[PDB]
């Protein structure tokens, strides 16, 4: 047996053995390709007229060998002058077997074509198509920046809040921890301010969802866009302030609403809690420890099947894959969860929400139960997303293997799929869901039932997932309460997002302050990350106090911990296990001070969120909103402006006794001593129970209380 598929598993980042590398080849350029052949004596291409011998031998090595590097062929042709057809032989001692025919062919970049972009005016220059004998696969662009002018914009960044000088690209990818380090993101849009020292700004807004890249050296910014049948580049131009920029962005592609005052309370969460008896243990010692918690998030609650029913919970399989209502459900005494309503009242009763996970995958692995009935239904009813060939599209990803993804880019199917979770919600009452994942779509030629390909509809999938659960509790009268790491551009309208995976490390501390900045410019206003991070390690008491004091001035302040196989020790990120980890008996009474300090900054939060809807405003906000032409600002990417009154400076390194804010233009308090502060460079004392924070004098009287 021998395998061959041109664009292989079309990973984002990185190439199958399987696969044509590149996929379109520059004309002149060789090509490299790969076949999968695990028993074979030997195995040659027939390349045009030639024939070339194949030989023995980005990717982990453990991905590569799930993909057969083992046992994978390759060769590098002779540059592409031409389209050429190609197939490949193998035998094994003398039994032989031939691939089917494959075709390339080489592409060039002209000046010369049909193909347009609109909209960019003068700014636009330099334009040119990607063409071959297929079609005009891309178009590429200039826009005019000037001196001074900054980058800042793209969804969600982690490296940097000015991208100028860098490449980058958006496309929605799931990259596991180090999301800085390796320059991607769970959040991308097209989209990004132009800031400058003089002159007006303004900002562009690519409108595609397919994928884009992005590259700025001297004078220009180079923009390189992935095209479907037609030649046309749209291009947005918006001008003005960054916040009026920021506006003419959201009025095209939407905006948050005002969620409910509660989410600006403490957030708790672990994988491992995985029984109502432990979820109930946690937040009883929340609640003796005297540290405020608003909502807690239960991610293991499910079945670990169809992940929309409680572990343990007995009913009939309905064989035609319909939805469940509450009735349907037992709940046995010596179950995981024996009584969750219970649990849910009395949470509810100490003015705790709860948060249900998620993830857009059904599970093919299992013949039986509700889960394959459901999978069944998803195939003969038209609820999956499906390849080319109209087969369901299978999780090309390590884990669900296989799984289905339901297409939520139409309301059928956002119905159907919703409503398999409708008696949580009604029944349960539950207040929100975890909406994790949605990066799972990998190929052009994916079809969706709206009547997009993947190439396009693939980025898309995270916003309509989010928006599919946002209906779901608006249909059932609450507020659309989804917690996402993955969306794109319209993703600013459902919901609330957080940072995603990784190391408790200060360099991740710093790359999620960036990731929460940037975001935020781009209209994402509910933000949020897991203070000093979920993954390995407990982190030690000074990253996690100083990430908790920080967190506390964020949109969301958050804290979770990674499944670890409910070893001992417990890799919770509670205050009082990191505090016994430690052996600091610093934590817990300083995390409780940040807390508490946070409960009484929630009307300020809520009002300010208000506004920021209002006026787009951003309500973690990058200096450059509202001191544009103070050129020092640049020198102090991670400050920000919670709201309009306070600016927050998070100590962000190990072993600081002191700290130093840059003040914009006007009149400063600082919070701690109430004390005036002049404008300017200002340093003071960071003992682990203060993070540098500063008042506009003139509103210090209402927000004197909240740090009395």
């Given at each position: 047996m021998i395998k061959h598929r041109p664009h292989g598993i079309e990973h984002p980042y990185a190439v199958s053995p399987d696969q044509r590398v590149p996929v379109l080849p520059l004309a002149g350029e060789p090509v490299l390709l790969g076949v999968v052949a695990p028993e074979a004596d030997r195995v040659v291409c027939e390349w045009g007229t030639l024939e070339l011998p194949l030989s023995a031998t980005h990717l982990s090595e453990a991905q590569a060998k799930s993909l057969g590097a083992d046992g994978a062929w390759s060769v590098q042709t002779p540059p592409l002058a031409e389209p050429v057809k190609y197939r490949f032989h193998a035998h094994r001692g003398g039994a032989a077997e031939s691939t089917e025919w494959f075709e390339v062919s080489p592409a060039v970049w002209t000046a010369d074509g049909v193909g347009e972009v609109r909209g960019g005016g003068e700014r636009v220059r330099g334009v040119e198509w990607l063409v071959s004998s297929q079609g005009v696969h891309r178009g590429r662009f200039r826009l005019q920046l000037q001196d001074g002018d900054?980058?800042?914009?793209?969804?969600?960044?982690?490296?940097?809040?000015?991208?100028?000088?860098?490449?980058?690209?958006?496309?929605?990818?799931?990259?596991?921890?180090?999301?800085?380090?390796?320059?991607?993101?769970?959040?991308?849009?097209?989209?990004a301010h132009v800031v400058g020292a003089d002159g007006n700004g303004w900002g562009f807004h690519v409108r595609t969802s397919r994928r884009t890249w992005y590259s700025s050296a001297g004078n220009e910014l180079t923009v390189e866009v992935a095209l479907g049948d037609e030649p046309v580049v749209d291009l947005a131009i918006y001008e003005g302030d960054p916040a009026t920029v920021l506006t003419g962005f959201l009025d095209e592609v939407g905006r948050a609403e005002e969620l409910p005052g509660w989410v600006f309370r403490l957030w708790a969460s672990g994988n491992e809690w995985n029984t109502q008896q432990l979820v109930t243990a946690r937040m009883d010692t929340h609640r003796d420890l005297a540290i405020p918690v608003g909502a807690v998030v239960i991610e293991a609650w499910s079945d670990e099947q169809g992940i929309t029913i409680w572990r343990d919970a007995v009913y009939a399989v309905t064989e035609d894959g319909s939805a469940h209502r509450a009735e349907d459900f037992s709940y046995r005494p010596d179950g995981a969860w024996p009584d969750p309503k219970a649990m849910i009242d009395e949470l509810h009763a100490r003015g705790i929400k709860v948060i249900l996970w998620?993830?857009?995958?059904?599970?093919?692995?299992?013949?039986?139960?509700?889960?394959?009935?459901?999978?069944?239904?998803?195939v003969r009813d038209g609820h999956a997303v499906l390849e080319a060939d109209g087969t369901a599209y299978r999780n090309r990803g390590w884990w669900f293997p296989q799984a289905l993804m339901?297409?939520?880019?139409?309301?059928?199917?956002?119905?159907?799929?919703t409503e398999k979770r409708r008696y949580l919600v009604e029944h349960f009452d539950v207040d929100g869901f975890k909406t994790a994942g949605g990066e799972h779509a990998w190929g052009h030629d994916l079809v969706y039932a709206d009547g997009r390909k993947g190439d396009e509809g693939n980025n898309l999938y995270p916003v309509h997932y989010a928006r599919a659960f946002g209906d779901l509790l608006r249909s059932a009268g609450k507020a659309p309460v989804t917690f996402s790491r993955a969306g794109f551009t319209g993703s600013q309208a459902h919901g609330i997002f957080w940072a995603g995976d990784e190391d408790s490390t200060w360099q991740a501390f710093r790359s999620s302050v960036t990731a929460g900045l940037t975001a935020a410019s781009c209209g994402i206003v509910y933000w949020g990350w897991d203070l000093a991070g979920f993954s390995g390690p407990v982190p030690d008491a000074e990253?996690?106090?100083?990430?908790?004091?920080?967190?506390?001035?964020?949109?969301?302040?958050?804290?979770?911990?990674?499944?670890?196989?409910?070893?001992?020790?417990?890799?919770?990120?509670?205050p009082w296990h990191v505090a016994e980890t430690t052996g600091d008996d610093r934590v817990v009474p300083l995390f409780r001070r940040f807390a508490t300090l946070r409960e009484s900054l929630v009307p300020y939060l809520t009002e300010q969120a208000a506004r920021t809807i209002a006026t787009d405003r951003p309500l973690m906000r990058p200096l450059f909103f509202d001191h544009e032409n103070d050129p020092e600002i640049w020198n102090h990417p991670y400050q920000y402006l919670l709201g309009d009154e306070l600016l927050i400076n998070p100590v962000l390194e190990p072993g600081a006794t002191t700290w130093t804010t840059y003040l914009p233009a006007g009149e400063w308090i600082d919070v701690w001593t109430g004390d005036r502060v002049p404008s300017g460079l200002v340093t003071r004392d960071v003992p682990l129970e203060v993070v540098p924070v500063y008042c506009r004098a003139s509103r210090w009287s209402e927000l004197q209380p909240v740090f009395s």
């Open positions: 900054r980058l800042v914009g793209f969804g969600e960044r982690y490296d940097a809040l000015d991208q100028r000088g860098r490449e980058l690209d958006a496309v929605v990818f799931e990259q596991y921890k180090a999301q800085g380090v390796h320059g991607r993101t769970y959040l991308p849009m097209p989209f998620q993830i857009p995958l059904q599970k093919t692995e299992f013949s039986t139960g509700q889960v394959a009935a459901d999978a069944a239904a998803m339901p297409d939520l880019s139409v309301q059928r199917t956002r119905d159907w799929w990253l996690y106090l100083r990430a908790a004091a920080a967190s506390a001035f964020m949109p969301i302040m958050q804290y979770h911990s990674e499944f670890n196989h409910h070893q001992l020790p417990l890799r919770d990120r509670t």
